[PDB]
Amino acid sequence: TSVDLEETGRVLSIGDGIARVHGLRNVQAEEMVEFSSGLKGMSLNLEPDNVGVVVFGNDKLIKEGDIVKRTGAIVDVPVGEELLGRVVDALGNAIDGKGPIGSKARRRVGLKAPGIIPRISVREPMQTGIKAVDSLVPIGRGQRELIIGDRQTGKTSIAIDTIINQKRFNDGTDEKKKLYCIYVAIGQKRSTVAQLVKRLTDADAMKYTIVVSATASDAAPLQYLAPYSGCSMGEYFRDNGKHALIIYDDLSKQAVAYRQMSLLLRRPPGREAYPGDVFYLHSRLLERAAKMNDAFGGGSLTALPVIETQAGDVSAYIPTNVISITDGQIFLETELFYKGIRPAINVGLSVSRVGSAAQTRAMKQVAGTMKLELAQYREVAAFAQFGSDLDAATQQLLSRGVRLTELLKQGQYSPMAIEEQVAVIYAGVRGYLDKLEPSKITKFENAFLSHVISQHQALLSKIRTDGKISEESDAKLKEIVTNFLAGFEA
Amino acid sequence: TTGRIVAVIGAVVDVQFDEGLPPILNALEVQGRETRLVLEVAQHLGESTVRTIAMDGTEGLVRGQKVLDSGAPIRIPVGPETLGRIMNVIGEPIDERGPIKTKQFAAIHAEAPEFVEMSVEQEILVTGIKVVDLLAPYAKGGKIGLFGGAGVGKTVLIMELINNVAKAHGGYSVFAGVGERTREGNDLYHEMIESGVINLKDATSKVALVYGQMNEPPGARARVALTGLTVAEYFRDQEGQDVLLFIDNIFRFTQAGSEVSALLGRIPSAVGYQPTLATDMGTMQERITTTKKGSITSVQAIYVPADDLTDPAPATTFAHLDATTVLSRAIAELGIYPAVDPLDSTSRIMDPNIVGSEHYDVARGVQKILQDYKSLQDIIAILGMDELSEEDKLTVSRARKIQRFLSQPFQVAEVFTGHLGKLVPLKETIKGFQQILAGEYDHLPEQAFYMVGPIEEAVAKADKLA
Amino acid sequence: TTGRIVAVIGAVVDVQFDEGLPPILNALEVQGRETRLVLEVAQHLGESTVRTIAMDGTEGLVRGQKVLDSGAPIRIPVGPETLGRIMNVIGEPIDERGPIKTKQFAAIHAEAPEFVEMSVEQEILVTGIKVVDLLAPYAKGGKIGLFGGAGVGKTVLIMELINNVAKAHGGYSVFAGVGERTREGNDLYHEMIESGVINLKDATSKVALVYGQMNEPPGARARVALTGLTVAEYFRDQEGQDVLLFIDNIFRFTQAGSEVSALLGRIPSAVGYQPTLATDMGTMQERITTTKKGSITSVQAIYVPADDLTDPAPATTFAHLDATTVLSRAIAELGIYPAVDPLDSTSRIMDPNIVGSEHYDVARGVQKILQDYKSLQDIIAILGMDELSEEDKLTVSRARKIQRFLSQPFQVAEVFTGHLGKLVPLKETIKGFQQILAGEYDHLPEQAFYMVGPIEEAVAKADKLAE
């Protein structure tokens, strides 16, 4: 004889991924429940006469009258080094055809970020291998740095070059310098994610990368969940004295999936039909990226969330919401992209909130004042557009800025080692490029870099080991660029 | 068993069942109609009552009217005998040629190919259209989208592509008319009979047609794209053959969804759209794809409401595409056809490792000069070209010639241009724009580059002028 | 009295009481929780049911769970033992240093001081920040607001003010972290230990810390400002000494109210905000004040959503301030830091009878030249510099030098600028702008004036820029 609607319930209605359930008197808020068919759902609305359950899958598998059963707890995922090299869904299920995922550890998806005490200031470099990023808007371990811009401005490519960049460290035996990577795809098409994975495999980068994918035909709850699940995989490394990087590609699509769920749970819309707490959705996720003090292992999780703007409006609602969470942003623009400024980074509008503390001394030496200087250069360039009599100082400011702009142009899929970056920036910042035609700067950089790689590995290796430019290294560099430049000008 | 209608508002019909409730997506059959009226189960409302979406008009329905459960979603004829035929949303022949006696049927709802089924093959599909081939090339088995406001050139472009691609293609084609002009379907059908790509006397037809146009109620317009897809899915999977899929116009799918959502009583999303806009689109678009099992080269015309590319419908469509051709009203009004925006049209295969450095360099070089011309528009609009520096005047003159050389007479648009249609080899497209960028034709008048094929025609045209 | 949870939707929890219904604002204690979970009563819905806002996460709550009425609003530790410590919304220590060694408590909800309690005293508080001191100076015991969109420099400025004003302050300071970054809380905490303004071993701590950052649910973020200011009110009223109160960021109080508004059954007002936005703000702001009993110099960082200063949240905040520092992305984008809009920052004490005629004349002169240039920029961008009269191009060159001389390297911004921080005396600020206005540096390059302290550095920079 059954009268117990405490541990079970019955579907009253089902539509658009929302089941309203009678009973389930003992169900907890946010508890995962199971339908008759095997489908799972999260209990998000506990109302006096019903439970509003969001469905993790196709609601054709749910009917009025179907039983719903308590699970006892909230959502969790497979966690550990066994996920490396694997493509999984929003719940860590293997979707790559390589076989079941067998980790010795599991972790909850909805855990709160570490507070003030477990933390310590971001101070370790997270190298992207992208000159413009590492020099102008540097990222440290434990930092959150947004990648933001219109469609097809190069956002994913920043994240991809960054993942590929870590191979240099990961092939070694120093565990404190390694960086394990997590790419979370939200709302993308499966073929795009597949091409992404092919790229990471060809560069031999997949071996230290977990791909977490909730795609366009996955139900809205799965897309909403994917960032948190990926975050939990990354928090494993963070809490065990290791360093992880997580990319959320993208949070715009997660917000859209969350908006759907919320509207269909009949929670009243706010600005742009997004739920009243759309900020909190992203702020709780991104706060979990953190740098841990030595007491907690000294590990870290670095986040690169991605936001898509419309018509280049960085000042929009959701963009400024996410800008107002992260420790800086890399802003990309179509205008710059097609002008040949690739990576298409707007310097003045991009920031890092950690700054030189996230740089090696060598990089800090060559790039210390460059960001404000380039911001000022663009103002003067715009103002001097007409060929009106300009003084020597403004002309010099323009000459330098034009040449540094060329130097920060970079191709794809060849992220640069830090000592190499310092060496090229050095030639620009010390004034050796000032008399060269702007059109020949990339030619100079290509020839100069290949030369110092060829003949001066002792110098580069010394900059990499010391992490700085000593007075001896500075004298050697000075001799090299002077003689090289004298040959290049003829 | 049997249900009874309890509520009707436009496309939305509520039905109560006494014994056994149809699952979501099941096709219900309304009893006593002159022509088949299908209701698709959308939701279970509670109290043994389902909410459904009609596939045809609901006029004449009465509360208490009997409804039967077919025990399956909408199922349609699939296979070789769909070729040469026209069907509607529910797979009925609408060409007056009798039954479509296929050996198999298929439900119009199928799950999208899984991640494991994806192909990473990226091979260029040369169209002979200069703008496309140069700047944003299409790929074989790729997803192509043609964006455009009202009257700018979507359908002319899709028709030119059917002319340039399909004949060079060795396989089957499926055309889905979705919320567009019925008379455009009549035109296409009879032109295909005339050319012989549809044969009424033999089994040699290479095209299957599916139509649910702007005379249809929204349930039909929302589902007819799925009908088209299902036909293509068969040819891709059960024949493992190269398929071409043409859809005009996929926006109409989302618009129809907005109309039904309003009738379903959902809380509306931004711009009055259904809260399910993106997931609905994803579940449909993810089926329009090449797999390891077979190739679908898909070309979808995409309507742009009030010319606003940030409208949730077109804005959400971009990420579903491998190549995008974005048309511009401003460009059309200047007389440049096809009215492609050369700075807003993209392709995944625009990559030096794919198209070769020469192709890539000329493309980016063309785009640089066009962007440099663009960000002078403010000053030019006020003071004209004569105020600019000699340097900027040079970039304006070349950009204007490039803009014109990007225009091209279409075989399909001969009545409107007055010129014989032209198809240009890729190597000739690269060479022509290469020469312009190099300044080889700085002396030639701009109008010489307008509405030609290869660069030699621009030379010959200038010779006749002076 | 004991109730049962009847509904849970996000941060909003409905509780039914069979008997003694708790009044609005009361703090309720959820039973069967590992860590203390407080619900604040917001409404009486009828049918013996109250609607409440949770001060922590609602995960794990069950319909039927018992809830106790504490018989009072949220009460927190106040007094000198809060100094050098970190507290949360409900008064708990979050610094791993054990209990707050106090037994004096205060409700976080309180009536604002009456009209009779108001002070009209207003004297200049010099910051050493040129743009602030020259154009819109702060007043001791006054209400100061720092407006800005995302990432324009609100926090850097507040930290510079703490560095320039609070490190040499004769009383106590309260910093309230409201809906911001936890990393910034850790940064500030360890910085004050390094400077000695917080001492972990003796009782010489000068600053009390209260935090509820953007990792917390909206109830916490809606109430942490009240907690922070309650600590401040004690130091003002029960002592009588001068208090500095820093809040970053007060927008987050209004944002948190908007997050729960629909679930509290409210029809939205304009721009998705709660209908109660202005009265909510008024009851909170009117407590943040100097009285005849004691002085509070308050500095509040104010977020501006979508950079729109007409957004209801910042728009409603302006009227609560005596001095306004408005930061602009348009200015930050140029590398001009601090990114202060000199044509949108104001102060009650910018009056010739208060600051003197010299100060006032130079400030208005600077604003005039900058407004004249702003109006010309767009015309000259199209028609060209050569079309300007000699009088116009003189105002252009001087204005551009003035714009640059308003920029300044901050000590707290050394990691961003690559320049040593500078503090400029008010005397030197006035003189410097006076001389530029008078055409005394017409012969010097533009860039000499960028990112320096006193005017002597611009001269020295001009000499260095030669060779």
PDB file of C-alpha atoms in Angstrom, chain B residues 155-302:
ATOM      1  CA  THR B 155      16.701  33.843 -54.171  1.00  0.00           C
ATOM      2  CA  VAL B 156      18.502  35.016 -57.319  1.00  0.00           C
ATOM      3  CA  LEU B 157      21.751  33.913 -55.632  1.00  0.00           C
ATOM      4  CA  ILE B 158      20.425  30.492 -54.582  1.00  0.00           C
ATOM      5  CA  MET B 159      19.078  30.009 -58.137  1.00  0.00           C
ATOM      6  CA  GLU B 160      22.459  30.923 -59.666  1.00  0.00           C
ATOM      7  CA  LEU B 161      24.119  28.399 -57.328  1.00  0.00           C
ATOM      8  CA  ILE B 162      21.668  25.682 -58.427  1.00  0.00           C
ATOM      9  CA  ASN B 163      22.781  26.645 -61.954  1.00  0.00           C
ATOM     10  CA  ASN B 164      26.527  26.637 -61.161  1.00  0.00           C
ATOM     11  CA  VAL B 165      26.868  23.818 -58.609  1.00  0.00           C
ATOM     12  CA  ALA B 166      24.119  21.238 -59.232  1.00  0.00           C
ATOM     13  CA  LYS B 167      25.022  20.445 -62.859  1.00  0.00           C
ATOM     14  CA  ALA B 168      28.709  20.038 -61.935  1.00  0.00           C
ATOM     15  CA  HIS B 169      27.536  17.914 -58.979  1.00  0.00           C
ATOM     16  CA  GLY B 170      27.097  14.138 -59.224  1.00  0.00           C
ATOM     17  CA  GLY B 171      24.234  13.141 -56.922  1.00  0.00           C
ATOM     18  CA  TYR B 172      20.767  14.165 -55.762  1.00  0.00           C
ATOM     19  CA  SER B 173      19.322  17.528 -54.747  1.00  0.00           C
ATOM     20  CA  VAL B 174      16.537  18.440 -52.340  1.00  0.00           C
ATOM     21  CA  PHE B 175      14.835  21.841 -52.475  1.00  0.00           C
ATOM     22  CA  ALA B 176      12.728  22.875 -49.476  1.00  0.00           C
ATOM     23  CA  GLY B 177      10.483  25.904 -49.978  1.00  0.00           C
ATOM     24  CA  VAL B 178       9.870  27.268 -46.497  1.00  0.00           C
ATOM     25  CA  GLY B 179       7.486  30.222 -46.053  1.00  0.00           C
ATOM     26  CA  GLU B 180       8.317  31.786 -49.410  1.00  0.00           C
ATOM     27  CA  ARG B 181       6.367  32.538 -52.616  1.00  0.00           C
ATOM     28  CA  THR B 182       4.169  29.743 -53.989  1.00  0.00           C
ATOM     29  CA  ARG B 183       4.665  31.212 -57.478  1.00  0.00           C
ATOM     30  CA  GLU B 184       8.456  30.822 -57.023  1.00  0.00           C
ATOM     31  CA  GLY B 185       7.801  27.084 -56.487  1.00  0.00           C
ATOM     32  CA  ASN B 186       5.697  26.983 -59.666  1.00  0.00           C
ATOM     33  CA  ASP B 187       8.536  28.707 -61.558  1.00  0.00           C
ATOM     34  CA  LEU B 188      11.181  26.279 -60.221  1.00  0.00           C
ATOM     35  CA  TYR B 189       9.109  23.135 -60.824  1.00  0.00           C
ATOM     36  CA  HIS B 190       8.282  23.978 -64.456  1.00  0.00           C
ATOM     37  CA  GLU B 191      11.793  25.224 -65.263  1.00  0.00           C
ATOM     38  CA  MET B 192      13.103  21.872 -63.979  1.00  0.00           C
ATOM     39  CA  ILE B 193      10.617  20.059 -66.230  1.00  0.00           C
ATOM     40  CA  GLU B 194      11.798  22.199 -69.174  1.00  0.00           C
ATOM     41  CA  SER B 195      15.504  21.566 -68.488  1.00  0.00           C
ATOM     42  CA  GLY B 196      14.910  17.887 -67.723  1.00  0.00           C
ATOM     43  CA  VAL B 197      16.302  17.730 -64.166  1.00  0.00           C
ATOM     44  CA  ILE B 198      12.743  16.628 -63.417  1.00  0.00           C
ATOM     45  CA  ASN B 199      11.473  13.982 -65.835  1.00  0.00           C
ATOM     46  CA  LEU B 200       7.761  13.162 -65.733  1.00  0.00           C
ATOM     47  CA  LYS B 201       8.150  10.190 -68.106  1.00  0.00           C
ATOM     48  CA  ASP B 202      11.172   8.411 -66.587  1.00  0.00           C
ATOM     49  CA  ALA B 203      12.868   7.650 -63.252  1.00  0.00           C
ATOM     50  CA  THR B 204      15.775   9.958 -64.155  1.00  0.00           C
ATOM     51  CA  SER B 205      14.850  12.927 -61.906  1.00  0.00           C
ATOM     52  CA  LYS B 206      17.679  14.252 -59.724  1.00  0.00           C
ATOM     53  CA  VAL B 207      15.697  16.614 -57.485  1.00  0.00           C
ATOM     54  CA  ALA B 208      13.107  16.106 -54.739  1.00  0.00           C
ATOM     55  CA  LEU B 209      10.838  19.031 -53.845  1.00  0.00           C
ATOM     56  CA  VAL B 210       9.156  19.838 -50.517  1.00  0.00           C
ATOM     57  CA  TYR B 211       6.975  22.939 -50.071  1.00  0.00           C
ATOM     58  CA  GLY B 212       5.235  24.838 -47.268  1.00  0.00           C
ATOM     59  CA  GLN B 213       4.966  28.456 -48.399  1.00  0.00           C
ATOM     60  CA  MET B 214       3.728  31.814 -47.031  1.00  0.00           C
ATOM     61  CA  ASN B 215       0.076  30.852 -47.709  1.00  0.00           C
ATOM     62  CA  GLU B 216       0.366  28.195 -44.975  1.00  0.00           C
ATOM     63  CA  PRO B 217      -0.501  28.510 -41.303  1.00  0.00           C
ATOM     64  CA  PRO B 218       2.477  28.613 -38.889  1.00  0.00           C
ATOM     65  CA  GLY B 219       2.481  24.938 -37.786  1.00  0.00           C
ATOM     66  CA  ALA B 220       3.104  23.907 -41.388  1.00  0.00           C
ATOM     67  CA  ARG B 221       5.762  26.600 -41.894  1.00  0.00           C
ATOM     68  CA  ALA B 222       7.517  25.561 -38.649  1.00  0.00           C
ATOM     69  CA  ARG B 223       7.679  21.851 -39.589  1.00  0.00           C
ATOM     70  CA  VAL B 224       8.206  21.847 -43.381  1.00  0.00           C
ATOM     71  CA  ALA B 225      11.988  22.371 -43.060  1.00  0.00           C
ATOM     72  CA  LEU B 226      12.104  19.113 -41.051  1.00  0.00           C
ATOM     73  CA  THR B 227      10.207  17.388 -43.888  1.00  0.00           C
ATOM     74  CA  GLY B 228      12.868  18.615 -46.355  1.00  0.00           C
ATOM     75  CA  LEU B 229      15.698  17.510 -44.039  1.00  0.00           C
ATOM     76  CA  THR B 230      14.211  14.025 -43.626  1.00  0.00           C
ATOM     77  CA  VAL B 231      14.168  13.525 -47.398  1.00  0.00           C
ATOM     78  CA  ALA B 232      17.844  14.592 -47.554  1.00  0.00           C
ATOM     79  CA  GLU B 233      18.810  12.461 -44.522  1.00  0.00           C
ATOM     80  CA  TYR B 234      17.657   9.346 -46.380  1.00  0.00           C
ATOM     81  CA  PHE B 235      19.836  10.107 -49.413  1.00  0.00           C
ATOM     82  CA  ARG B 236      22.818  10.900 -47.145  1.00  0.00           C
ATOM     83  CA  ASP B 237      22.540   7.758 -44.974  1.00  0.00           C
ATOM     84  CA  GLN B 238      20.653   4.967 -46.757  1.00  0.00           C
ATOM     85  CA  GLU B 239      22.406   5.709 -50.050  1.00  0.00           C
ATOM     86  CA  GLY B 240      25.717   7.132 -48.750  1.00  0.00           C
ATOM     87  CA  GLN B 241      25.694   9.622 -51.614  1.00  0.00           C
ATOM     88  CA  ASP B 242      26.581  13.288 -52.167  1.00  0.00           C
ATOM     89  CA  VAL B 243      23.463  15.358 -51.509  1.00  0.00           C
ATOM     90  CA  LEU B 244      22.747  19.028 -52.185  1.00  0.00           C
ATOM     91  CA  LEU B 245      20.158  20.665 -49.957  1.00  0.00           C
ATOM     92  CA  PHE B 246      18.686  24.061 -50.840  1.00  0.00           C
ATOM     93  CA  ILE B 247      16.349  25.851 -48.418  1.00  0.00           C
ATOM     94  CA  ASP B 248      14.475  29.110 -49.172  1.00  0.00           C
ATOM     95  CA  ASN B 249      13.943  30.472 -46.583  1.00  0.00           C
ATOM     96  CA  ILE B 250      15.104  29.151 -43.169  1.00  0.00           C
ATOM     97  CA  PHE B 251      14.197  32.343 -41.244  1.00  0.00           C
ATOM     98  CA  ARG B 252      10.571  31.434 -41.948  1.00  0.00           C
ATOM     99  CA  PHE B 253      11.018  28.383 -39.652  1.00  0.00           C
ATOM    100  CA  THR B 254      11.882  30.677 -36.711  1.00  0.00           C
ATOM    101  CA  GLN B 255       9.200  33.267 -37.546  1.00  0.00           C
ATOM    102  CA  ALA B 256       6.570  30.487 -37.662  1.00  0.00           C
ATOM    103  CA  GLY B 257       7.858  29.359 -34.242  1.00  0.00           C
ATOM    104  CA  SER B 258       7.306  32.885 -32.922  1.00  0.00           C
ATOM    105  CA  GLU B 259       3.685  32.793 -34.138  1.00  0.00           C
ATOM    106  CA  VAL B 260       2.946  29.451 -32.395  1.00  0.00           C
ATOM    107  CA  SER B 261       4.816  30.439 -29.204  1.00  0.00           C
ATOM    108  CA  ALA B 262       2.477  33.440 -28.874  1.00  0.00           C
ATOM    109  CA  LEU B 263      -0.453  31.007 -29.104  1.00  0.00           C
ATOM    110  CA  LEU B 264       1.137  28.582 -26.587  1.00  0.00           C
ATOM    111  CA  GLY B 265       1.174  31.356 -23.971  1.00  0.00           C
ATOM    112  CA  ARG B 266       4.937  31.213 -23.246  1.00  0.00           C
ATOM    113  CA  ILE B 267       6.469  34.278 -21.587  1.00  0.00           C
ATOM    114  CA  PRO B 268       8.063  35.972 -24.620  1.00  0.00           C
ATOM    115  CA  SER B 269      11.802  36.549 -25.028  1.00  0.00           C
ATOM    116  CA  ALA B 270      13.615  39.548 -26.604  1.00  0.00           C
ATOM    117  CA  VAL B 271      11.937  41.270 -29.617  1.00  0.00           C
ATOM    118  CA  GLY B 272       8.792  39.183 -28.961  1.00  0.00           C
ATOM    119  CA  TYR B 273      10.431  35.891 -29.945  1.00  0.00           C
ATOM    120  CA  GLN B 274       9.864  32.406 -28.504  1.00  0.00           C
ATOM    121  CA  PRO B 275      12.081  31.689 -25.452  1.00  0.00           C
ATOM    122  CA  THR B 276      13.113  28.495 -27.274  1.00  0.00           C
ATOM    123  CA  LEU B 277      14.471  30.258 -30.381  1.00  0.00           C
ATOM    124  CA  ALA B 278      18.069  28.953 -30.071  1.00  0.00           C
ATOM    125  CA  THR B 279      17.377  25.376 -28.960  1.00  0.00           C
ATOM    126  CA  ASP B 280      14.631  24.970 -31.587  1.00  0.00           C
ATOM    127  CA  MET B 281      17.097  26.225 -34.189  1.00  0.00           C
ATOM    128  CA  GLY B 282      19.880  23.988 -32.854  1.00  0.00           C
ATOM    129  CA  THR B 283      17.772  20.814 -32.904  1.00  0.00           C
ATOM    130  CA  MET B 284      16.861  21.537 -36.532  1.00  0.00           C
ATOM    131  CA  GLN B 285      20.242  22.867 -37.806  1.00  0.00           C
ATOM    132  CA  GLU B 286      22.324  20.064 -36.273  1.00  0.00           C
ATOM    133  CA  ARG B 287      20.533  17.646 -38.645  1.00  0.00           C
ATOM    134  CA  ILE B 288      21.581  19.721 -41.666  1.00  0.00           C
ATOM    135  CA  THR B 289      25.060  18.300 -41.809  1.00  0.00           C
ATOM    136  CA  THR B 290      27.594  16.134 -43.550  1.00  0.00           C
ATOM    137  CA  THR B 291      28.549  12.976 -41.638  1.00  0.00           C
ATOM    138  CA  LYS B 292      31.163  10.231 -42.090  1.00  0.00           C
ATOM    139  CA  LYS B 293      28.295   8.313 -43.741  1.00  0.00           C
ATOM    140  CA  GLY B 294      27.547  10.885 -46.454  1.00  0.00           C
ATOM    141  CA  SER B 295      27.874  14.442 -47.695  1.00  0.00           C
ATOM    142  CA  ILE B 296      25.301  17.225 -47.588  1.00  0.00           C
ATOM    143  CA  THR B 297      26.284  20.519 -49.185  1.00  0.00           C
ATOM    144  CA  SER B 298      23.618  22.809 -47.769  1.00  0.00           C
ATOM    145  CA  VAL B 299      22.686  26.299 -48.956  1.00  0.00           C
ATOM    146  CA  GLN B 300      20.130  28.178 -46.840  1.00  0.00           C
ATOM    147  CA  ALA B 301      18.651  31.549 -47.748  1.00  0.00           C
ATOM    148  CA  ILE B 302      18.278  33.572 -44.544  1.00  0.00           C
TER     149      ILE B 302
END
